[PDB]
Structures are given as structure tokens and as C-alpha cells.
Amino acid sequence: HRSDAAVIVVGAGPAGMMLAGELRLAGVEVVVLERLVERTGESRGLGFTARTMEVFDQRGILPRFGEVETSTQGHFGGLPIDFGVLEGAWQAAKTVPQSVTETHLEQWATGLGADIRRGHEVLSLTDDGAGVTVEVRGPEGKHTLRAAYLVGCDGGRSSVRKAAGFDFPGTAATMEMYLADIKGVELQPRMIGETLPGGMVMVGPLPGGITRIIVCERGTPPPPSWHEVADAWKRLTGDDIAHAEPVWVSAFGNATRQVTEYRRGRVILAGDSAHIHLPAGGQGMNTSIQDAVNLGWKLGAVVNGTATEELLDSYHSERHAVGKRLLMNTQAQGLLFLSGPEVQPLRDVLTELIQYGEVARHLAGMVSGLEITYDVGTGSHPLLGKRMPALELTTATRETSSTELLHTARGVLLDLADNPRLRARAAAWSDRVDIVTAVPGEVSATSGLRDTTAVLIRPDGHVAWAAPGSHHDLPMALERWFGAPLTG
Amino acid sequence: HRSDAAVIVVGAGPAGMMLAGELRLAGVEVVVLERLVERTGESRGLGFTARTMEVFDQRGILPRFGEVETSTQGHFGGLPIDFGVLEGAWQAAKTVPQSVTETHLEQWATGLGADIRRGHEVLSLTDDGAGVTVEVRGPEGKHTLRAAYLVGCDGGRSSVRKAAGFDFPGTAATMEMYLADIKGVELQPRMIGETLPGGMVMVGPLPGGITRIIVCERGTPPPPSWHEVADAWKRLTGDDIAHAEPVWVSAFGNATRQVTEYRRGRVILAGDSAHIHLPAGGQGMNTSIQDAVNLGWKLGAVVNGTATEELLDSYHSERHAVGKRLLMNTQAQGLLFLSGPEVQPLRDVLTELIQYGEVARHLAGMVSGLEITYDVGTGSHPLLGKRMPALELTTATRETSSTELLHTARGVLLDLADNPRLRARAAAWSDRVDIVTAVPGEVSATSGLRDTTAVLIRPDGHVAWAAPGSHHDLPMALERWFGAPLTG
Ligand SMILES: Cc1cc2nc3c(=O)[nH]c(=O)nc-3n(C[C@H](O)[C@H](O)[C@H](O)COP(=O)(O)OP(=O)(O)OC[C@H]3O[C@@H](n4cnc5c(N)ncnc54)[C@H](O)[C@@H]3O)c2cc1C
Numbered sequence: 001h002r003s004d005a006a007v008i009v010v011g012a013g014p015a016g017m018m019l020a021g022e023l024r025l026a027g028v029e030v031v032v033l034e035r036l037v038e039r040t041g042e043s044r045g046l047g048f049t050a051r052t053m054e055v056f057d058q059r060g061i062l063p064r065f066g067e068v069e070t071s072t073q074g075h076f077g078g079l080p081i082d083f084g085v086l087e088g089a090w091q092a093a094k095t096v097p098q099s100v101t102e103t104h105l106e107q108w109a110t111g112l113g114a115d116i117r118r119g120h121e122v123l124s125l126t127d128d129g130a131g132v133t134v135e136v137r138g139p140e141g142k143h144t145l146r147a148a149y150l151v152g153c154d155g156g157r158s159s160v161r162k163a164a165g166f167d168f169p170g171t172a173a174t175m176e177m178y179l180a181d182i183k184g185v186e187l188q189p190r191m192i193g194e195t196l197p198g199g200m201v202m203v204g205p206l207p208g209g210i211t212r213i214i215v216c217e218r219g220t221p222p223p224p225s226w227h228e229v230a231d232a233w234k235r236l237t238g239d240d241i242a243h244a245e246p247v248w249v250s251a252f253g254n255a256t257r258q259v260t261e262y263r264r265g266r267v268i269l270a271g272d273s274a275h276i277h278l279p280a281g282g283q284g285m286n287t288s289i290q291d292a293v294n295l296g297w298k299l300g301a302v303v304n305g306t307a308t309e310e311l312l313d314s315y316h317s318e319r320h321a322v323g324k325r326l327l328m329n330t331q332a333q334g335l336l337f338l339s340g341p342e343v344q345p346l347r348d349v350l351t352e353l354i355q356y357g358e359v360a361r362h363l364a365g366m367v368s369g370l371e372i373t374y375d376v377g378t379g380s381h382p383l384l385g386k387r388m389p390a391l392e393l394t395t396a397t398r399e400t401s402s403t404e405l406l407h408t409a410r411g412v413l414l415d416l417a418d419n420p421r422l423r424a425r426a427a428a429w430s431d432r433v434d435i436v437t438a439v440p441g442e443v444s445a446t447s448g449l450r451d452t453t454a455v456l457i458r459p460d461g462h463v464a465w466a467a468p469g470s471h472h473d474l475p476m477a478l479e480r481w482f483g484a485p486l487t488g
Numbered sequence: 489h490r491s492d493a494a495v496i497v498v499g500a501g502p503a504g505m506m507l508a509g510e511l512r513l514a515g516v517e518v519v520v521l522e523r524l525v526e527r528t529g530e531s532r533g534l535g536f537t538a539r540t541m542e543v544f545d546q547r548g549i550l551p552r553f554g555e556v557e558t559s560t561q562g563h564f565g566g567l568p569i570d571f572g573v574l575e576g577a578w579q580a581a582k583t584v585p586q587s588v589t590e591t592h593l594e595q596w597a598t599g600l601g602a603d604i605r606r607g608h609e610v611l612s613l614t615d616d617g618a619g620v621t622v623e624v625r626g627p628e629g630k631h632t633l634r635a636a637y638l639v640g641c642d643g644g645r646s647s648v649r650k651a652a653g654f655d656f657p658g659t660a661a662t663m664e665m666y667l668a669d670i671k672g673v674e675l676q677p678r679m680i681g682e683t684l685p686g687g688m689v690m691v692g693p694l695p696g697g698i699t700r701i702i703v704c705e706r707g708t709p710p711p712p713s714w715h716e717v718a719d720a721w722k723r724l725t726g727d728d729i730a731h732a733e734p735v736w737v738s739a740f741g742n743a744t745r746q747v748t749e750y751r752r753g754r755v756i757l758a759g760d761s762a763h764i765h766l767p768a769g770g771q772g773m774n775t776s777i778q779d780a781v782n783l784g785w786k787l788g789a790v791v792n793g794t795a796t797e798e799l800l801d802s803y804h805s806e807r808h809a810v811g812k813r814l815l816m817n818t819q820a821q822g823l824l825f826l827s828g829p830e831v832q833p834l835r836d837v838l839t840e841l842i843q844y845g846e847v848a849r850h851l852a853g854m855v856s857g858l859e860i861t862y863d864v865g866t867g868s869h870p871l872l873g874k875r876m877p878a879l880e881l882t883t884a885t886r887e888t889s890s891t892e893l894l895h896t897a898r899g900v901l902l903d904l905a906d907n908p909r910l911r912a913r914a915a916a917w918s919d920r921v922d923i924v925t926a927v928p929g930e931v932s933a934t935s936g937l938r939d940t941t942a943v944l945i946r947p948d949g950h951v952a953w954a955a956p957g958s959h960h961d962l963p964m965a966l967e968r969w970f971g972a973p974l975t976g
Pocket residue numbers: 010011012013014015016033034035036044045046047048098120121122123153154155156158159179252270271272273279281282283284285286287288
């Protein structure tokens with residue numbers, strides 16, 4: 001297989017596998033180097049957000065998952081919120097283990113022709129502005145690979161970040177917590193957590209008679225034996241579970257850091273390699289998958305020569321902003337979860353505020369990722385920069401949807417008012433952008449789609465331009481996200 | 489003067505002086521015992537809330553103050569909020585020193601015939617269910633006084649609370665802060681506070697070239713020399729102010745406690761004696777004055793024999809609830825003010841939430857006291873249990889207002905639709921309740937007064953009943969707050 005690719009991805013976690021699939025959709029030759037021979041089989045995370053559900057759906061990935069339980073029951077820092085107040089938030093997957101999601105993403109990417117090389121550890125890396133050479137240890141021993149670009153999707157302790165000179169400011173961990181998947185004992189469920197006099201606790205069932213416990217005890221300084229975790233449980237809850245059978249026991253911290261640059265030269269980061277934090281609020285995997293979704297189409301266009309690196313710079317500006325918000329979100333939730341009775345007054349105030357619809361929707365927007373808004377220029381149209389909500393469509397020949405039209409990761413221009421001029425203005429981008437004339441289905445008052453005659457949708461599903469109500473014109477938007485018009 | 493009164497009040501702070509005046513309005517003989525010969529001349533507090541302004545106005549107290557600067561600029565935990573989003577919140581006094589407010593309340597109460605005995609310290613107290621005897625040291629030496637009821641308005645370190653067996657649960661102080669009024673140096677104002685890397689700081693001007701500083705430095709364990717306060721300033725701000733002239737230097741803490749019972753037998757508490765907390769958010773004096781306003785008319789009715797002690801029990805239930813909220817409010821604000829960078833994520837979330845009108849109004853309601861709602865029974869009418877907003881009124885003979893009609897601290901029944909039956913239904917309470925037929929002025933959509941035909945207003949200004957939309961009937965409300973109907 002040896003020696004060259006267009007893009008090398010380090011790491012086959014959720015970020016790397018989603019990225020690999022996205023690059024394949026862009027027609028890019030991609031090699032993934034993963035040190036592990038076999039998926040860790042972990043599933044620290046359970047379920048995924050409504051926005052993650054949507055980014056899967058828009059690539060036609062969901063049938064791989066079969067029937068998936070969804071839920072509108074949410075929380076913020078353990079404060080319950082009905083996320084059903086926010087349109088589309090219902091799409092959150094409740095229970096799917098991270099290992100299962102990873103499996104489907106790997107199978108998808110591989111099916112698309114990603115060259116995934118397991119048992120290959122990147123030991124080091126080099127970048128001169130022509131390319132990136134990595135040294136790798138595989139089954140064949142030590143060897144080198146070179147590509148135009150290298151993406152570190154190699155996790156919170158990223159070799160790539162360390163080697164490629166990224167600055168990683170933030171705060172050092174101040175506490176160690178535990179999780180344990182266990183058998184034998186039946187415990188009273190606490191799906192959104194339980195505030196205790198000396199900390200916090202989560203309890204929940206998993207298939208095969210497994211109970212998952214999350215143990216966050218007061219005053220613990222930052223692989224754990226089961227009995228210290230049991231001892232932590234006993235002190236917190238008063239209940240002895242030392243007799244249980246430990247399936248998996250793990251430790252984690254609250255170190256919170258983010259790279260100042262998502263790209264240095266030809267070396268880019270996506271996922272935990274760019275941002276680490278307390279895993280509070282079910283955000284890390286979701287954000288990491290979504291980093292890859294932002295990146296893949298852009299890096300693909302650059303590799304394909306259809307876009308300049310101005311486009312590539314927008315991965316940094318858009319995702320650094322999301323990552324900053326991620327750190328705020330998780331730190332805020334962590335404070336509410338983990339601080340003692342001291343923080344109760346603030347829990348109580350926030351609880352009162354949650355009773356207002358705008359607050360419930362605000363927090364739901366933050367947790368679900370449905371709030372995410374990119375700078376695509378100004379205008380009155382409510383959807384600018386936001387994700388395109390699912391929209392049913394009837395064309396001259398078929399019934400389809402915005403979601404389905406995104407399966408090939410192209411741009412999509414919806415002509416919702418049969419305007420042939422619109423079709424002609426954009427025809428110079430028709431090699432990169434599918435121009436679809438359709439009658440739209442019924443849309444809600446709050447969807448942002450009422451009275452909309454046209455929408456330009458980026459390959460990631462975000463709205464770049466809409467009519468009416470964009471200050472920038474359509475060709476400006478097409479040029480910004482798709483590059484130069486075709487020469488007639 | 490010696491030996492007897494109907495009610496003895498211990499302490500001539502804001503609570504005791506407001507209470508004394510309220511009892512006089514009820515026609516009650518009241519003796520106030522205050523240990524200090526001369527007002528401390530302190531003014532820890534500056535200005536007062538919109539609700540305090542209203543409770544002064546409704547007794548015709550305001551002319552004593554002359555022209556008073558008001559402001560809509562508020563904050564919650566140092567997060568700025570335009571309180572102007574909430575009707576009536578504009579009435580907050582910005583700068584009036586606590587010592588000035590105390591002076592006017594003392595002059596008012598004395599003018600009304602309160603017997604205030606300064607240099608009289610209550611050393612001890614006794615209660616058998618017939619009365620309360622106190623031993624007192626005055627200029628004449630040691631002597632005893634007896635009355636039907638005793639009210640401890642004797643501050644955070646209440647002798648009365650300690651002696652009368654009140655339970656005072658809460659949390660012990662965990663930090664010591666400083667304040668200093670100083671001359672000589674001109675400092676950049678920070679009227680709502682300034683978050684620093686090692687704490688928080690407030691700076692503001694006062695008449696006579698005085699700058700007030702509030703110094704809350706990281707890691708200080710719970711009379712201070714000026715130079716330790718200057719040293720605290722220097723470490724926090726980097727600025728040397730040791731050369732300044734200290735006018736007053738004071739220490740305070742964040743001990744947060746509340747009595748479980750506002751009344752035990754014939755011994756009642758009002759003010760700091762019932763509740764202590766961090767003085768964050770300008771709440772203590774305001775709540776203490778407002779405790780007295782709740783109590784005075786009720787205790788007066790009991791002394792006058794027109795009400796039973798069920799009425800007296802409602803002082804506990806109503807004000808314990810307000811005091812609980814006070815502890816929540818001040819603790820929440822204190823956390824936001826005083827915690828390090830660690831709490832920044834929560835400041836940032838709350839800042840986003842404050843941009844929603846319902847949130848801004850919610851927080852403004854809490855800080856101003858305009859939110860305060862008592863259990864007076866159920867119904868759809870929006871004002872039940874809440875304060876009566878100022879309402880202009882034209883009667884057959886005069887132009888008046890709800891505010892003016894409350895000057896004598898009687899009940900007020902507003903007949904806003906010329907309904908003579910209403911007048912007859914309530915006539916049996918006309919000895920205690922002024923029944924006023926009037927054409928109401930213009931009222932706002934949000935005042936709660938639109939389409940209101942009648943309102944029963946308690947002597948404290950709270951709405952007990954309204955038409956339409958009360959589940960309880962008018963006689964039920966009259967009986968509940970005013971006692972038995974007159975026998976024809
Ligand atoms: C207790 C816990 C609970 C969590 N719960 C949730 C949740 O509920 N929801 C949610 O969204 N997120 C959750 N997360 C976060 C989530 O698991 C991570 O954010 C996610 O795994 C990050 O994905 P990634 O692809 O960026 O990195 P990883 O998943 O860590 O993948 C990194 C990969 O790179 C490989 N690698 C490293 N170095 C090299 C090298 N030199 N050469 C080749 N390969 C290399 C590693 O073997 C690894 O497979 C949780 C995390 C924890 C710890």
C-alpha cells in the first residue's frame with residue numbers, strides 16, 4: 001500500500017473516522033494511521049446529540065444503526081430540562097454506546113475507500129510548506145509516509161499537537177473522578193445525576209444486566225482498583241457495593257484546554273486533540289465528530305484545487321469558536337454538578353430561570369449543538385450561518401429532502417419559488433453545487449424557513465446565504481464557500 | 489416614663505425604627521430600647537431598593553428625604569442589568585447613606601409618639617404566655633420593663649434571639665472582607681464591581697471628596713488596621729493607596745443563617761436578628777425595613793384585639809419565606825462576585841441569559857423586591873399576594889392614589905366600577921378598611937390592573953383579593969386580614 005496519500009489522518013476515533021468518510025465523499029485519497037490493532041471496546045459515551053443525529057442523517061449513515069431510541073429529556077449541570085421545547089432536539093440518541101457509533105463510522109469510511117491502517121503508530125512528524133512526512137511504526141517495523149496535509153485526530157494526549165508546535169493553554173486538572181461498569185447489584189437509577197452532601201453520583205442500566213456508575217467524591221486529588229471506587233461509593237451513598245463485579249473501571253479529570261490555532265501550516269487538528277475538558281454534558285464525541293464534518297469538505301476542496309486556503313482558514317475560525325463554547329458549556333455544567341452545597345443557590349436560581357421558554361430553548365440549543373452559528377455575512381434572514389433544518393421537497397421528478405440532497409457532500413442551492421434566473425446566476429458553480437428546483441413542504445413558524453424563496457446550503461449543512469434577507473449576494477456566497485465560477 | 493408599654497422593641501436600627509412608626513400608625517403604645525446613645529453614623533449601605541422606596545412613599549415619609557437620585561442601572565452578582573425592563577424598578581434610590589435613612593425613620597417614628605429610649609441596653613428577657621419582662625441597663629442603672637409583646641430588632645448578634653431560644657441554622661463564615669471610606673486618592677470607579685485574578689473590588693465616590701472601596705481578596709481567613717486593607721488593595725489591583733486617609737475601616741463575613749421561627753410565644757424577631765448573610769446585592773437593610781412593614785400592622789391589630797394570633801402567624805410564614813429567598817439571592821450573588829476565574833463559565837452563561845427579557849425582569853424582581861408574593865389564596869387575577877402598584881384615582885371629591893390612601897396604614901378597598909353592592913358587602917369592616925369609590929387612571933398592560941373592578945389592599949400594600957379572578961370571596965379576604973365583621 002506504501003508511501004503516499006493526499007491526506008494522512010492520525011487516529012481512528014470518532015473524529016478520524018468521520019473525517020475519513022467526509023474526505024472520501026470529496027474524492028480524496030486518505031490514509032488513516034491508528035496505533036490500536038482493535039477498537040478499545042470502551043463506550044465512555046452513551047448516545048449522541050440531536051445535531052450529531054442530523055450530521056449522520058445527511059450522509060445516509062443512519063440505517064447502519066437500525067432502530068435507535070431517542071429522547072427529549074435533557075439537563076444542564078444536572079438540572080432537568082425538557083429539550084422538546086426546541087424543534088428538532090427530539091432527535092438525540094439516548095443510549096447508543098460510543099464503541100457502536102465508532103464501529104459504524106469505521107465501516108462507513110472503509111466502505112467509501114478510506115485506507116485505514118491499524119497497528120500503525122505515528123512516532124513523529126515533519127512539515128515543510130510543500131508537505132508533511134510522518135515516521136510510523138507498523139507490523140512491518142518503522143517506515144515513512146508523506147502527504148499534502150496531516151490531520152491529528154489522535155485524542156487528548158495528541159502526539160501531533162505536541163510535535164507540530166501547537167500552543168495548548170487552559171487549566172490543569174484539579175480532581176480525579178471514577179466510572180465503573182459493574183454487574184451483580186441492582187441500584188436505583190439516577191440518569192441525570194444526584195447531588196450528594198459530599199459530591200455527585202450517576203447510576204444507569206446497560207444491556208446484559210450491566211449497571212453503570214459515575215462516582216465523583218469530595219476531596220479526591222487528581223488504572224483504579226475496583227475497591228477504591230466501591231469505597232468512594234460507600235462514603236457518598238452509604239451503600240456497600242464492594243461485592244459487585246467490575247467490568248470496566250476508569251479514571252478521568254477536569255483539565256480544560258484548547259489549541260490557539262486549529263491549523264499550523266499543513267498540520268490540522270480535529271477532536272480531543274484540539275480541546276480537552278471535563279466530560280460533563282455529553283459534548284466531547286459530538287463536538288469531535290462535528291469538527292470533522294466542518295473540516296472534511298473544506299480540506300477536500302483545497303486538495304481538489306477548487307478552493308484556496310482562505311476556505312481552510314474558516315475551519316479554524318468556525319471550530320475554534322465552537323470549541324471555546326464547548327469549554328464554557330462543560331465547565332459551567334461541571335461547576336453545577338460537582339461543587340458542594342455551596343453552589344446550591346445558583347442551581348436554584350438557574351432552576352427558576354429554566355421555567356422560561358427562552359432559557360429552556362437557549363440551554364437546549366447549547367447542549368444539543370443546534371445553536372451553532374457561523375459567520376457567513378450579515379442579513380435579516382434568521383437561518384444565516386445556522387444548520388439547515390430538515391425540509392421536505394417535491395421536484396419535477398421526485399420527492400426528496402434537504403437531508404437527502406446532502407448525502408454526496410456537495411453544495412445545495414434550493415430554488416423554492418421556481419426562479420429560472422436564480423438557476424442561471426449559480427450555473428457557473430453547478431460543478432460543485434446541486435441546483436434544485438422544488439416545492440417545499442409545510443414549515444413551522446420557528447424553523448426560519450417561512451417565506452424563504454432560496455437557500456444556499458454548504459456541504460456541512462450550514463446555510464451560507466438565503467433569500468430574502470442576505471446582505472451579501474448569492475455569487476459572493478458561492479465564491480466564498482465553493483471557489484471560482486466556471487469559465488464559459 | 490417607667491415600666492409599661494403594649495409592645496417593646498429592642499434596637500433602633502432601620503427595622504426597629506420602621507416598626508416603631510408602623511405600630512404608632514396602628515395606635516399602639518411602643519417603647520424602643522436602644523443601647524447606643526448616638527447613631528453609629530455608619531452607612532454601610534448606600535441607597536435603597538424600589539420596593540423600599542414604595543413602602544416609604546405609602547406612609548408619606550419621602551418628603552423627609554428631599555430630592556433623591558434614582559437609577560435603573562442594576563446588577564446581579566456584578567453582572568449588569570437594566571432594571572428599567574421592570575415597571576417601577578426605576579424608583580431605586582442610588583446613593584442615600586443608611587445613616588440618613590435611619591435618621592429619617594427615627595424622626596418619623598418619634599414624631600408619631602414612639603417612646604425611644606437610647607442608652608438602654610436589654611441585658612436579658614423573660615416570657616410567660618401572659619407577657620414579656622426585660623431587664624434593662626439605662627442611665628438610671630438596672631431596671632425592668634414589661635409588655636404584651638417583645639420584638640428583637642437588635643441585629644445580627646441578637647441578644648433576644650439567644651435569650652428567647654430561637655434556632656439559628658445555616659453555615660459558619662468562611663471568609664473576611666474589608667471596606668474602607670478614604671480620602672486623598674482619586675480612583676477609577678467600579679460601581680457594580682470588578683472581577684480580579686485574585687478576587688473582586690468595588691470603588692465609588694461619596695460626598696466630601698470621599699472614595700469608598702470594597703476589598704475582597706483571595707485566601708483571607710475569617711477592627712482592621714488601614715494598612716492591611718491597603719496591602720490587600722495593592723495585591724489585588726497593583727496600585728499603592730497606603731498614603732490615603734482612612735475615615736472608616738470595617739470587616740464583615742459571609743455567615744448565612746436564618747431563624748426557624750420568626751416568633752416564639754410573645755417574642756418576635758425582625759431584621760438581621762432573624763437573618764444574616766453576605767451583604768451582596770444591597771438586600772439586608774431593605775429586607776429588614778420590609779419585615780417591620782409586614783409585622784407592624786399585624787401586631788397592631790392583635791394588640792388592639794381586632795385580630796387573633798392566626799394573623800400574627802402570617803408574619804412568620806410570609807417573612808420566613810422572603811428571608812429564605814434573601815439567603816438564596818445573596819449567596820448566589822456572592823458566589824458570582826467572590827469566586828475566582830473558576831466561576832467565569834457560569835457568569836458567561838448567566839450573561840447570555842440576561843439578554844432575554846423574562847430573565848432580566850426575573851432578576852430585577854428578585855433584587856428590587858418587586859417579586860414578593862404572599863399566599864393570600866388562589867385565583868387567576870395576576871396581582872394576588874403581590875404589592876399594589878401605584879394607581880392614580882379620581883373620587884367624587886378628590887384626586888388621590890393607592891399610595892396616598894395607605895398613609896394611615898388601614899386596609900383599602902378600591903371600588904373601581906362604582907359598585908354599591910361591593911360597598912355594602914364590606915361595610916362591616918369599614919372601621920378597619922377604607923372603602924373608596926374611584927375612577928382609576930391609565931394602567932399598563934403589565935401592571936396587572938387592566939380590567940380590574942375592585943382590589944382589597946392590606947395595610948402593607950399587598951393585594952389580598954381582587955375582582956375578577958379570586959377563588960376566595962371578598963368577606964373571606966376581609967375576615968382573613970382584618971378579623972371579625974362588625975355586628976349590626
Ligand atoms: C468518562 C467519559 C465519558 C464521556 N461521555 C461522553 C458523552 O456522553 N458524549 C460525548 O459526546 N462525549 C463523551 N466523552 C468524550 C469522548 O469520548 C471523546 O471526546 C471522543 O472520544 C474524542 O474523539 P477523538 O476522535 O477526537 O479522540 P479519541 O476517541 O481519543 O481517538 C484518538 C485515537 O487516536 C489514536 N492515537 C493516538 N496517538 C496515535 C498515534 N501516534 N498513531 C496512531 N493513532 C494514535 C488512539 O489510539 C485513538 O484511537 C466522554 C469521555 C469520557 C472520558
